């Protein structure tokens, strides 16, 4: 705290309470007693625990029928109108779309829709596999996920 | 028909004014004006000028006969206290309070 390290009054003689610093955390415009620092909240997860979790929730999405597998999922031109038409034809609104390739027209056509997210098979995460209502996997993306996860 | 007049921020203490205001509570206004006329306090000047304003407001704005009017409610509230520093001996300071008031006079026929 910006201040001076001078006693605001002497120790005794006056009728007031003892005080040593105006920066005291009991004063107005004093310091914080346990003032915070920038800290890293990242936790370690073991690798086998991460894969155990993914194998658990992918098994659960199967048991809950929240997993849809298709051979191919492409949009011709990078248009969100085409993607929304295709998902309406699939009867899908809140969906994660995993593709074993890098499809740029699909990324661009899915960038404006907040109900829809498009990932690579490498870039899958458990919280997104849960936060989305349906998950559409290309069969190639299945082959890559099964290979990564043994 | 009740008619209100207020002298807000009256430069006087409420305790000093309530002594005067208690003399004319429930009285006819001709009697209250004679009491305040022959009361020697400063608060009598204040509360008389307020009663005169309430009478004229009741007559002008509400169409009321002066002889039937009667002081139904009167009360003095504490105002803002401006505060001053008065120096004392041995370098010691005292903060005096310079009290104010809110005089309110309600007059009616009832």
């Amino acid at each position: 705290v910006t201040g001076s390290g001078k006693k605001p009054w002497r120790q005794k003689g006056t009728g007031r309470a003892r005080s040593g610093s105006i920066k005291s955390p009991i004063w107005r415009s004093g310091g914080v007693t346990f003032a915070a620092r920038p800290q890293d909240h990242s936790q370690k997860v073991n690798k086998k625990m991460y894969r155990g979790a993914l194998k658990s929730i992918l098994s659960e999405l199967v048991r809950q029928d929240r997993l849809i597998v298709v051979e191919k999922f492409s949009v011709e031109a990078p248009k969100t109108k085409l993607l929304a038409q295709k998902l309406k034809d699939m009867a899908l609104e809140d969906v994660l779309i995993i593709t074993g390739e890098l499809d740029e027209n699909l990324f661009l056509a899915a960038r404006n829709l907040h109900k829809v997210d498009v990932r690579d098979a490498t870039g899958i995460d458990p919280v997104s596999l849960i936060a989305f209502d349906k998950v559409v996997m290309t069969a190639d993306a299945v082959k890559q996920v099964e290979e990564m996860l043994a | 028909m009740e008619t209100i007049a207020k002298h807000r921020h009256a430069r006087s203490s409420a305790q000093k004014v309530r002594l005067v205001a208690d003399l004319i509570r429930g009285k006819k206004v001709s009697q209250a004006l004679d009491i305040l006329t022959y009361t020697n306090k400063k608060a009598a000047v204040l509360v008389k000028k307020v009663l005169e304003s309430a009478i004229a407001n009741a007559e002008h704005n509400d169409g009321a006969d002066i002889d039937d009017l009667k002081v139904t409610k009167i009360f003095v509230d504490e105002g803002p206290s401006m505060k001053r520093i008065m120096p004392r001996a041995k370098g010691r300071a005292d903060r005096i309070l310079k009290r104010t008031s809110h005089i309110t006079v309600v007059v009616s026929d009832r």
């Binding site: 006056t14 | 041995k90 370098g91 010691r92 903060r95």
Partner: peptide
């Protein structure tokens, strides 16, 4: 005025008090 209050506190204690007023050492 709490700045004229600054004076008040800053030096109605810096007046320092004179002292005890009974020549008594309870000795």
């Amino acid at each position: 005025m709490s700045g004229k209050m600054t004076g008040i506190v800053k030096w109605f204690n810096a007046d320092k008090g004179f002292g005890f007023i009974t020549p008594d050492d309870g000795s």
